[PDB]
Every structure is written in structure tokens, then in C-alpha cells.
Amino acid sequence: MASMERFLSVYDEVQAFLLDQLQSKYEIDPNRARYLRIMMDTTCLGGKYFRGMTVVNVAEGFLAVTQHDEATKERILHDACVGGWMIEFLQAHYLVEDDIMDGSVMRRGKPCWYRFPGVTTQCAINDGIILKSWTQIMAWHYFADRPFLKDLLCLFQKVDYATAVGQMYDVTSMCDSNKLDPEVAQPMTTDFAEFTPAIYKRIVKYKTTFYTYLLPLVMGLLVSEAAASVEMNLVERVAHLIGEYFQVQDDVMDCFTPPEQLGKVGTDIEDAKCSWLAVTFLGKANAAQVAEFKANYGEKDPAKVAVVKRLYSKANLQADFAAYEAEVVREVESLIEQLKVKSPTFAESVAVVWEKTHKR
């Protein structure tokens, strides 16, 4: 059984479980079950399964070096798939809700879920709530008697919370902090004083890294009962680095990747996002370039968006990206080495995570 095959089969099983339970324990009728099946498929499937497959890969590594009965190998791999789906369904939650929050049009060359004719925002908000509730239903069902259940739920819960806090950092990133006030409509920053590397780093760490990198690695350790093979402060450091890198790639592609390939028309400029491009450009621009960026950023007008893209093009941001990439490659290699002291197997899984990130 290829890992991916096992992973995909477990989706089918988990889907059947959740829908069969709705019918037998929550009085659902067949049509509403079908609507939820479609919802689940539409919102959970079609991506790369990077996060969920990380859990599987980490567990697979430990299986190769640890003595177990066959049935135990199976149970561990099944747990790693369930845990991976918990993360994918968490992601699915965040995507449904974020797309609504941001008025997004497309996700993976298909309409965002709320835009489906028979969905609408009124249902989609709640569908997103259900998606995250299913992570917990999965956990309580499949992991009821597992020794790792407490630690898994407690971590999962902190990562979800961090992610929501990250969302708040992201949606408020173009405001002046000192002006935040629920009573007063929020103006866009004029000075862009908060477009700094440390501020950017805080957004990305919370919004993406905890759930995309830390949680899949640590879930893999927890289902393997292997958290003693690592120094958790290192696993955090390496996840922060790789996660930051991931987002900087995504930020560049929002701007420069053709929409057919991206699967999306990128709107970070019109949305006035604190992107790596913006922060990096502000870190090297001259006064006249800074005034021009300010006159044009955060505006729907396509000509103003083209002015911003031009400023970025002539600012030679490809140099800054190569240098940044160089330095991340350097630090990731260093942390992989430190990880080898307690676990070659876990260090190797992080190596694979990094290769898959660095080459995508």
C-alpha cells in the first residue's frame, strides 16, 4: 500500500463513519447527508494533501526503525491517516471561512464553496463550523482509548487557536495598530510603518506555520509515541523557518504567477496585504519609490496595481528572494543537523518536508 493510497482510503472510511453516525445518532435525513458529503468532498479534497501526508510520512519513518506486531504497524498508520485528515479538515474549515471573510472568488481553479448556487454564505459559514467539528468527532472516535489522546487534543486546540489569532493578524495587517477600535471604521495605513520583517514574521507564523508545519510533524510524533526522539524547541524552530519560506513563495506567486497556474486571480496588492514583496520593497526603496508605492497600493484600480508590480519588478526583488532562499537553505540544514542528534529518522522526515517545500 503506497502511503497516498492508504491516506485516500481512510478518507472514504472516515467520511462513511461521520455520515453513518449523523444518520444513526443525530437524526439526519438522506438529502442533508448527501449535501454534507458533497460539502466534505468539495472542501477537503483536490489539494496536495501535503499536511496530512506529512503525518503519514513521519509515522512511516518511525515504523522502519521500531519493532511492532503487524497489527500495530497497521494501527499506527491508520492513526497517522486519521490525524492527517484531522489537519486537512482543519485546513478546510479555515479555507471556507477565509474565502468568505475575504470575498474570494476561486480556490484551486474552482468557485469558493460559499459561491456555489445551492450553498450561499448563510450555509457556508455553518458548513465551515461543521468541518472543524468533524476533526473533533474523528479524534474522539478513532483515538478514544489512545494514550496520546490528551496531548493530541491539547496541541490541536492550541494550533487552532494560534491559527485564528494569525487570521486576526493577517486581516488587520494594513491597519494602524493604534487606530484599531470596533467603534470606528478602519482606515488603511498611510505610513506603512508596520510593514516590517518582524511584523510579517508574526503574521505568517500564526496564520500558516503552526497548522501547516508544526502540527503535521508533531501529530506524526504523537501517533508514533515518539515525542522523546526530539527536542520540541528545535521542531518549533525548523517549522517556523520552513513555514515562513512557504509563505514567502506564496506571496511572490500571488503577484507573479499567471492566474491559470495559480488557480486564482491574485489580489494581495489591491487587498493591501503585508506581503513579503511589499515589506522587502519598503526595505530597499528610495524616497520617491516609497511615495509612489503609497499612492498606488491597496486600490482596486488595475492601473494602480500595475504601478505597484512595476515598482517591484524594477526593485530587483529576485535578488532579495535568492538571498533569502540561500539563508533559509542554510539554517534549515543546520537545524536538520541538530535534529539528527536525537533522531535520524525524524531529521530525515524534516528533510523531505523541506525538499517538497523548496521545490514545489
Ligand X SMILES: COCC(=O)NCc1nc2ccccc2[nH]1
CA distance 127 to 122: 9
Nearest distance from residue 21's CB to Zn ion, in Å?
13
Annotated binding site for Mg(2+): 98, 102, 170, 250, 254
**Backbone φ and ψ of 188, nearest 5°:** -60, 145
Cell of 85: 485528515
Restricting to residues 200-229, which ones interact with a copy of itself according to CB under 8 A? 202, 206
**CB nearer Zn ion, residue 194 or residue 250:** 250
Selected from 60, 88, 97, 244, the binder of a copy of itself by CB under 8 A is 97
Instruction: Classify 118 as helix, strand or coil.
Output: coil
Residues 139-178 vs a copy of itself: string with x where CB under 8 A? Answer: -x---------x--xx--xx-xxx-xx-xxx-xx----xx
Binding partner of residue 210 among ligand X, Zn ion, a copy of itself, none, CB cut-off 5 to 8 Å per kind: ligand X
Secondary structure of 156-185 in the HEC alphabet? HHHHHHHHHHHHHHHHCCCECHHHCCCCCC
Binding partner of residue 254 among Zn ion, a copy of itself, ligand X, none, CB cut-off 5 to 8 Å per kind: Zn ion
Smallest CA-to-CA distance from 238 within 214, 257, 272 is with 214
Binding partner of residue 115 among a copy of itself, ligand X, Zn ion, none, CB cut-off 5 to 8 Å per kind: ligand X
Q: Does 196 interact with a copy of itself (rule: CB under 8 A)?
A: no
Nearest distance from residue 254's CB to ligand X, in Å?
20
Selected from 39, 58, 152, 241, the binder of a copy of itself by CB under 8 A is 39
**CB nearer ligand X, residue 151 or residue 176:** 151
Nearest distance from residue 232's CB to ligand X, in Å?
5
Q: Does 23 interact with a copy of itself (rule: CB under 8 A)?
A: no
Cell of 345: 529518522
Would you list the DSSP string of 282-306? Answer: HTT--HHHHHHHHHHTT---HHHHH
Residue 27 sits at the vertex; the CA angle it makes with 23 and 30, to the nearest 5 degrees, is 55
Structural contact between residues 298 and 270, judged by C-beta atoms closer than 8 angstroms: yes
Binding partner of residue 32 among Zn ion, ligand X, a copy of itself, none, CB cut-off 5 to 8 Å per kind: a copy of itself
The HSE-up count of residue 227 (CA atoms within 13 Å, CB side) is 15
Annotated binding site for Zn(2+): 98, 102, 170, 236, 250, 254, 268
Selected from 3, 6, 13, 102, the binder of a copy of itself by CB under 8 A is 102
User: Cβ-count burial of 71 within 10 angstroms (0-12 exposed, 13-18 middle, 19+ buried)?
Assistant: exposed
Handedness of CA 169, 171, 174, 176 (dihedral sign): negative
Residues 6+ apart with CB under 8 A from 182: none
Nearest distance from residue 112's CB to ligand X, in Å?
8
Binding partner of residue 97 among a copy of itself, ligand X, Zn ion, none, CB cut-off 5 to 8 Å per kind: a copy of itself
CA distance 142 to 14: 9
Q: Does 233 interact with a copy of itself (rule: CB under 8 A)?
A: no
Residues of the shown chain interacting with a copy of itself in the complex, contacts defined by CB under 8 A: 22, 26-29, 31-32, 34-36, 38-39, 42, 97, 100-102, 116-119, 121-123, 125-127, 129-130, 133-134, 136-137, 140, 150, 153-154, 157-158, 160-162, 164-165, 167-169, 171-172, 177-178, 180-186, 202, 206
